[PDB]
Amino acid sequence: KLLTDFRSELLDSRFGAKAISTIAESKRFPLHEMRDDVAFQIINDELYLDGNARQNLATFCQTWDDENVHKLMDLSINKNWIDKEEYPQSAAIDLRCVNMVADLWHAPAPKNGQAVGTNTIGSSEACMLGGMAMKWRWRKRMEAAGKPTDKPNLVCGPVQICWHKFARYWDVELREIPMRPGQLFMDPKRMIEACDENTIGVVPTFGVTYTGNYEFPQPLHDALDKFQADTGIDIDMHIDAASGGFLAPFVAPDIVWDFRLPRVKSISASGHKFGLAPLGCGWVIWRDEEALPQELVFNVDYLGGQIGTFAINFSRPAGQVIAQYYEFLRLGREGYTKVQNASYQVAAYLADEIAKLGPYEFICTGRPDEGIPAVCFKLKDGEDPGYTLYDLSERLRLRGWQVPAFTLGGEATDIVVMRIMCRRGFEMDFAELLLEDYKASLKYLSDHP
Amino acid sequence: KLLTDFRSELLDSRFGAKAISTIAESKRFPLHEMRDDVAFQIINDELYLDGNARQNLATFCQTWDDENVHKLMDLSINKNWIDKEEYPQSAAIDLRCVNMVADLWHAPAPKNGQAVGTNTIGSSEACMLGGMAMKWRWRKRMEAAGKPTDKPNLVCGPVQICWHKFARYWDVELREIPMRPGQLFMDPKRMIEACDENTIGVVPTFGVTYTGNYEFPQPLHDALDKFQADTGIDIDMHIDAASGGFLAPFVAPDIVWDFRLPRVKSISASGHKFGLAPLGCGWVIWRDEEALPQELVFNVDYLGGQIGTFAINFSRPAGQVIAQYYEFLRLGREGYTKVQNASYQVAAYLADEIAKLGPYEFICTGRPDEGIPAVCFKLKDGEDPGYTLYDLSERLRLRGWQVPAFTLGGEATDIVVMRIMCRRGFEMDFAELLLEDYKASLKYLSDH
Amino acid sequence: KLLTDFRSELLDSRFGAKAISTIAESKRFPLHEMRDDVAFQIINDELYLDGNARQNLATFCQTWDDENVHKLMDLSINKNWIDKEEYPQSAAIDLRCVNMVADLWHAPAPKNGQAVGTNTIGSSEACMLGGMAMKWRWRKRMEAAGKPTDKPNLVCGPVQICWHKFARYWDVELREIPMRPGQLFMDPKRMIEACDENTIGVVPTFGVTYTGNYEFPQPLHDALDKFQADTGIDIDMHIDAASGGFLAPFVAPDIVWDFRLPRVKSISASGHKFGLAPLGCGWVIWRDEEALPQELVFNVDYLGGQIGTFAINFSRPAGQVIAQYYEFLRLGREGYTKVQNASYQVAAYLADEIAKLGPYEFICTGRPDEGIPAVCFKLKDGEDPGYTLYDLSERLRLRGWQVPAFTLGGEATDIVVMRIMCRRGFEMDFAELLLEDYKASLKYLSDHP
Amino acid sequence: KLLTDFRSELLDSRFGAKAISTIAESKRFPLHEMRDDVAFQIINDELYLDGNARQNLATFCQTWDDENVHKLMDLSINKNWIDKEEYPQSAAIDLRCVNMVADLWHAPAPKNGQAVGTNTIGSSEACMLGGMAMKWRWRKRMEAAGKPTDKPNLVCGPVQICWHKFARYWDVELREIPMRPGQLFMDPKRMIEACDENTIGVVPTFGVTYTGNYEFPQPLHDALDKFQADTGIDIDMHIDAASGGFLAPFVAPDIVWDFRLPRVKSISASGHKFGLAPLGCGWVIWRDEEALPQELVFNVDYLGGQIGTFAINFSRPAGQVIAQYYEFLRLGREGYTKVQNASYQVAAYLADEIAKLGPYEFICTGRPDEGIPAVCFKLKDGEDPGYTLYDLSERLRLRGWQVPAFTLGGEATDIVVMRIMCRRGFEMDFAELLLEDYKASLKYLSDH
Numbered sequence A, C: 001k002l003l004t005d006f007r008s009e010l011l012d013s014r015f016g017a018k019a020i021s022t023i024a025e026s027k028r029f030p031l032h033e034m035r036d037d038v039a040f041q042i043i044n045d046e047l048y049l050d051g052n053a054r055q056n057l058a059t060f061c062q063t064w065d066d067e068n069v070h071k072l073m074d075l076s077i078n079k080n081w082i083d084k085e086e087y088p089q090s091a092a093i094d095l096r097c098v099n100m101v102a103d104l105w106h107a108p109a110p111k112n113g114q115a116v117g118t119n120t121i122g123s124s125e126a127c128m129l130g131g132m133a134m135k136w137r138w139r140k141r142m143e144a145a146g147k148p149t150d151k152p153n154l155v156c157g158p159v160q161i162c163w164h165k166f167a168r169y170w171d172v173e174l175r176e177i178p179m180r181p182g183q184l185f186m187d188p189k190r191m192i193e194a195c196d197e198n199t200i201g202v203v204p205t206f207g208v209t210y211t212g213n214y215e216f217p218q219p220l221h222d223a224l225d226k227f228q229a230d231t232g233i234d235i236d237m238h239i240d241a242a243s244g245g246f247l248a249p250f251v252a253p254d255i256v257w258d259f260r261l262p263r264v265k266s267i268s269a270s271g272h273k274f275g276l277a278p279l280g281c282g283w284v285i286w287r288d289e290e291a292l293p294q295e296l297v298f299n300v301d302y303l304g305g306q307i308g309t310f311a312i313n314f315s316r317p318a319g320q321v322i323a324q325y326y327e328f329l330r331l332g333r334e335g336y337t338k339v340q341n342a343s344y345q346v347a348a349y350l351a352d353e354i355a356k357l358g359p360y361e362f363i364c365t366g367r368p369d370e371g372i373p374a375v376c377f378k379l380k381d382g383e384d385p386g387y388t389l390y391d392l393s394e395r396l397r398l399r400g401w402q403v404p405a406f407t408l409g410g411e412a413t414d415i416v417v418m419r420i421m422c423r424r425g426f427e428m429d430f431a432e433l434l435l436e437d438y439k440a441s442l443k444y445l446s447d448h449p
Numbered sequence B, D: 001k002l003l004t005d006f007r008s009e010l011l012d013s014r015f016g017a018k019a020i021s022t023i024a025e026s027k028r029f030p031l032h033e034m035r036d037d038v039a040f041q042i043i044n045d046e047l048y049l050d051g052n053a054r055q056n057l058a059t060f061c062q063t064w065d066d067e068n069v070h071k072l073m074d075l076s077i078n079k080n081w082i083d084k085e086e087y088p089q090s091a092a093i094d095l096r097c098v099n100m101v102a103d104l105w106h107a108p109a110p111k112n113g114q115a116v117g118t119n120t121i122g123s124s125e126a127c128m129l130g131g132m133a134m135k136w137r138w139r140k141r142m143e144a145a146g147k148p149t150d151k152p153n154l155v156c157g158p159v160q161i162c163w164h165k166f167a168r169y170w171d172v173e174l175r176e177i178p179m180r181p182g183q184l185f186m187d188p189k190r191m192i193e194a195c196d197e198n199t200i201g202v203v204p205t206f207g208v209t210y211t212g213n214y215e216f217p218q219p220l221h222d223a224l225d226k227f228q229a230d231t232g233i234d235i236d237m238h239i240d241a242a243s244g245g246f247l248a249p250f251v252a253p254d255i256v257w258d259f260r261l262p263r264v265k266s267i268s269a270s271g272h273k274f275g276l277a278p279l280g281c282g283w284v285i286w287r288d289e290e291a292l293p294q295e296l297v298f299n300v301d302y303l304g305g306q307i308g309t310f311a312i313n314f315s316r317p318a319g320q321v322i323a324q325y326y327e328f329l330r331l332g333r334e335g336y337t338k339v340q341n342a343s344y345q346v347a348a349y350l351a352d353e354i355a356k357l358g359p360y361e362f363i364c365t366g367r368p369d370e371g372i373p374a375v376c377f378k379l380k381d382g383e384d385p386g387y388t389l390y391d392l393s394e395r396l397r398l399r400g401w402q403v404p405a406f407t408l409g410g411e412a413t414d415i416v417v418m419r420i421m422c423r424r425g426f427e428m429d430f431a432e433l434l435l436e437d438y439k440a441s442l443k444y445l446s447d448h
């Protein structure tokens, strides 16, 4: 029988083959090789249950990339970002990106022509690096003054989860100012009340994930200036600009949020959100050499010279930084402006149209001077139109859309909001389709209450 | 006037276009859009200066991937690993890989059908997760007996730099036993001298980068058993198996290095090394739930339920894990054995042939019971054949090969070695071409 | 065991397969078939040792072709250039190319609307054809005068090797005017001194390979006019325009080098150098029907008529002539001008920048009125900066560049030059990279003398 | 005004664009650039008028190539065959092909491990190299005995035109023994009558184009042996094996035609015929170093060493040799035999079936011991079935087939034959369709 078994293995179509007759292994390392077309097909087919990323309106990350980015990423699948000597031109492109991001954020013109900063996998790694640099600068300052350094704290607003991870992993007490009704962000008064000489720094979120709105660093900065005048305590900022960092420079250049403020010692952002890079690209820039403690830096060989690295990851692909550079050259300020405008235009259209459909109060309407291209809203207080925003999120899912409804944190856990993200590749015509599905979902719900 | 400029912008070939007449911007964010084919061309051409990855014999990482992996990675370009609810089947495939890797390393069969471990970007993140968990278990041990926890140290041999970064970033004193002539590894005697009540753990390197040889955990394990009997101090191990974790299980199954040893609480390896995954894949497995302190774990929603995450990175692509899972199913144990065997057959051929060409002493000759598929050698003490291994490396570079020569560390900084890595995609016929260039280089050097 | 051997042959990945475990056959015809993916992979991988053609700066031939040329060549892989009846439209396209090249070189407007000339594989074949036509025209002239025809000679400057091959294969004495310091080309005085009644013709090289400079035919032509007035000996020219033939018409149309000169009876050029065709395309044009002896022509069938062929090769692909025609239509004079300008611009930039780095004397600086887009230079006489140009060529190779250093011939064998060719696909940004590597190579050499 | 013209140039579909409204330039170098997609489209469409190469049954050359060959040729588009130092591994692969072809033809095992021979663009260049070498060896023979060298001749049968070009271009008198009814080849008796002390060599055609039959060198060889005994004149042979050199070694190994015969000093063949290479590949091999006069050889630098070149062409692509080498490794002797066998099985089927349809006399029926896989036939003497083979050829053309009818040369210019070539890619099912059209054509002709 084994002779014809081989014949069938050779000649059978992939759906007729004996190999595709079993459920895929999920518990132990498999013993045998299998026909490669069958292994590929089974996995391809499972991934349909992820759903359609273009209809995922919960994520802030890129769900479309141009044809040149597909090619560049494929060309770069084996290029190792950390091996600066072995892939020297990829390393040179990375360093150009550092200069360009620093220039966008108005970093002081660097002495030797190279800005201080690095690429990362994402804002998470970039925030941990900014956070370690803060803890170290604070330690040195406390040692100069003969104070103990065993109780650091960090003051912040409604941050993304990575900051809670930072605090846990590096033994820093987190002082989060809670959201409450009427102020869903860190205000200067509440911030100052949480500051003391053990505060390693303050972290405004320039593009809050929950609501889509900017926390503005300028009023916070004014308070810290007054704090130093009144107490002598000198506190710095790190801006978590995961979203806002590739938005405001293009569509709202007069907001003063970046290195134009002297206490901003570092800024981080996700290239793979509004920076237009594919997943796996983040940036952190320091204001100058003094803002990055040298004891955190590890030197590696690079072309008869040496380059300073600051990284948690080691080997990883260089495609994403190469793709980021392509977007910088191909679009420039002009192109980024047009692409971001298109997102804000779609958000404004949706905020405008959804307003006429129900009893809603908007927290974010996609104004460029207020936040990111997002639409965020709640049911108006003490109305019951016969559905919750959860019921509406569920109806929209029947058509493949992921549109999240969730409660806020802090003292706002009573409040349920729905948030729609407007990214590149969510064009007006495609938005109109979501809107048709929103109208049809409401029709259904008003008929089955 | 500007109309003839627009006409040319539309019609010019990309090498004749005005946009390709300038040097690419390097200092400031560019102001204007440019023709996409021109932007692509300039960058594509710059990247030729990286050289040829297939001829890079310095790296341990994958420099070839099969056609299915190219397809899967392109299909997964925008699938987010951290968003378990948004990409639920990518998440499920990830959990299968954790089970399979735990099985490979003889993790005790899991209670609830799911091994304790996680995917990472690479061994570096995986080692920091393993390190933090070691430091936390030690803190708890010390607190149960009323003792101070302010002076943690970690004992190790000739580790990769990520362990130096771990020590610096988490304020742990590193006790690195230095390499010395005649012992280029952590021996049990020196390991014990460095251990005390403040030792959070011992990290053997199951595949040392500098030499390619295994540090064998078993004799170290016997020593820590006597240490506990003698002193009452109970020390765990984490195995840094960045290369070895996907070699020995297939080609040297009788080496006892993994969870079969009681003191081994966690193990890490690089999928994108000998795991055959593309760049951006690592693993760490814990022996059971008790080995991972729950205060390090952050729970997320997953399909009505909740799953525990332990990660430093947040958003990052899921293609590498999907690729890994494809290699597991497509190759299985049988195919992994055949692929690694081809690498060892190539290392053994080169060790053999290079030995005829000069006065060389081999530190690693590509034997599977002793290490990874690498060739590592020095010039014999005493002899001077008229060249150093640096001159040899430079001659080989003229033909595009990257073959590193470097000094060893610690107390062996007088020893210069050359190391050749034999990876997937460095087949016998291709290695013969390297050997012909080695022969040509020596001839040239003897004539000068 | 043979049963599982087959299983493995079926199922094994290409790098795990038993077939890829041996060194490739190099001595005898192999006996067995092998899996086709393994045969392809082994050969693909060997070819990496060729290096990167885009970084080969020694060659004058095309190392990049546009996407339409890749498609047209693939479509034409089986189309046979010599089979005029069997591939009749490919044959018609070839004939159009002849008219267009003749028109570019100012050939007299042809009587019946078809110029006299042919496509070849390259300038080598085209030069042998021009050379045979010269030998035959001379024989006839010598017979009319009752002189013997057993000692033909050919007068020339610093020619490419094909002319030495011509002389050896057709029993013609080669009278090469040697290069000497101060005149690296054939001058009118030395040329006339080598001319006699046995001279079948004179061959100026319009784009000398060694230096990159034009030998100008006009001053030579004036001398031959005077020679005929003084002695009655009437000598013709063939221009070897391998390079210059697709440069000067676009960027220096006022140089009189072509059929505007009455003694120019034929001209050859390589399409696959500056003609922008892929390797395998050359052209030779005769001034009129009388310049091509009929006894050298073989007629073949073509559409109820007959076409005259003159060719050494027989079967060969027609893709290259098809690609040449596409470039003619797609670029025209306008497009060729822009592409050649881009090469001259890169050469000027490199001549300018290299000048500041060392004690150099330039022989070619990429001026369009003087020669081709090449940079050619030597160490200044009696300086020793502690390296030779050989040492510099070697350092540049570490980064994958092929930049040749070599001695000149004739009485200039003391002189070592370095030559950089600037072709299509060697854009300014890419040139800047070579320049960085040149600066870094000099740093190294001044530190290890 | 001109702004609406630019807008249209950007937006128009390629068949709606203004640029495609004119007839392509044919007389003068064009003045302006045009949209690249339009330039491509016009030319692509013109090339439909070539007809379908797969249906061209007149040619001996490859009209199909496998996917790997398409890839290799595209990858080699810019690799220069003549630049041995600049493309050194392309050069090395070329030298392997020379060894393998010499081995196939039973060349005496080479002294220094490298056969004497070269790749060429085709048999035509290869025959001129072989011819020049014959003329030079003869010159030297004559000079050693004080004799004049001004009247060389060459003796041959029904050769392809390249031999006529060789004679004209190198001033050699051609002594072509003409075909005649009952003997359509050079027989030993007429060959000897044409030989004298001025004969540079004899060129048998191992695969005659006009008929498809082999001229067998062995009986000619026996005759030249008697000639030397009788007269003392020593004459060499060059075999023009343009088709036969890649057939007989695989399917008729017992035919003695190659270097097994002492007088055979050189052999040429077309790779791009039955060698399975794409257009642009030929070979010529010499029996040893002595057979190739060194004054014809031009040396070039190759990796510290130097190699001898003999070539008329200079720059030309290296893809065809790389492709050839791929077919050698991928097929070997086993696969070449299976491919050629399929061609002979198709010729034998057609000879068989066409014989039932009319009053025909076969000159070639696709037997491997007699010739190449071709069908060649005439109308039987006497009979007139109401059509000529020209009418038949024209009816077949209505369905896209190119099947030539033509008169034979020499003293047989009264004989009209039809010839069908059975190449790779003319499979049994496709040949059945040709036979159905042949049947339909005859029916039509009988009704008119």
Ligand SMILES: *Cc1c(COP(=O)(O)O)cnc(C)c1O
Pocket (backbone or CB within 6 Å): A060, A121, A122, A123, A124, A125, A159, A160, A162, A205, A207, A208, A209, A240, A242, A243, A270, A282, B313, B314, B315
């Ligand atoms: C996304 C985000 C992060 C996390 O960054 P990744 O790019 O996902 O690593 C941190 N903070 C904010 C405000 C974010 O939006």
Ligand SMILES: *Cc1c(COP(=O)(O)O)cnc(C)c1O
Pocket (backbone or CB within 6 Å): A313, A314, A315, B060, B121, B122, B123, B124, B125, B159, B160, B162, B205, B207, B208, B209, B240, B241, B242, B243, B270, B282
């Ligand atoms: C490669 C390696 C590392 C680093 O892992 P990455 O996968 O590069 O992050 C750590 N330790 C050892 C022994 C290694 O070989």
Ligand SMILES: *Cc1c(COP(=O)(O)O)cnc(C)c1O
Pocket (backbone or CB within 6 Å): C060, C121, C122, C123, C124, C125, C159, C160, C162, C205, C207, C208, C209, C240, C242, C243, C270, C282, D313, D314, D315
């Ligand atoms: C290139 C060249 C040749 C040879 O032509 P191919 O195109 O290489 O056959 C002859 N003469 C000169 C001046 C050349 O530049």
Ligand SMILES: *Cc1c(COP(=O)(O)O)cnc(C)c1O
Pocket (backbone or CB within 6 Å): C313, C314, C315, D060, D121, D122, D123, D124, D125, D159, D160, D162, D205, D207, D208, D209, D240, D241, D242, D243, D270, D282
């Ligand atoms: C085809 C052929 C030739 C010509 O060879 P090409 O490969 O077309 O140059 C010469 N002689 C014979 C017998 C042929 O068949």
Ligand SMILES: O=C(O)CCCC(=O)O
Pocket (backbone or CB within 6 Å): A058, A059, A060, A061, A209, B080, B083, B086, B315
């Ligand atoms: O943008 C992401 O993918 C992660 C954060 C927001 C979310 O998806 O819920």
Ligand SMILES: O=C(O)CCCC(=O)O
Pocket (backbone or CB within 6 Å): A080, A083, A086, A315, B058, B059, B060, B061, B209
């Ligand atoms: O494997 C790698 O790529 C990183 C470390 C080893 C090296 O390249 O030297």
Ligand SMILES: O=C(O)CCCC(=O)O
Pocket (backbone or CB within 6 Å): C058, C059, C060, C061, C209, D080, D083, D086, D315
């Ligand atoms: O252009 C070529 O390829 C041949 C001549 C110049 C050279 O390469 O050396």
Ligand SMILES: O=C(O)CCCC(=O)O
Pocket (backbone or CB within 6 Å): C080, C083, C086, C315, D058, D059, D060, D061, D209
């Ligand atoms: O094989 C060829 O293509 C050329 C000669 C034979 C013919 O086509 O008639």
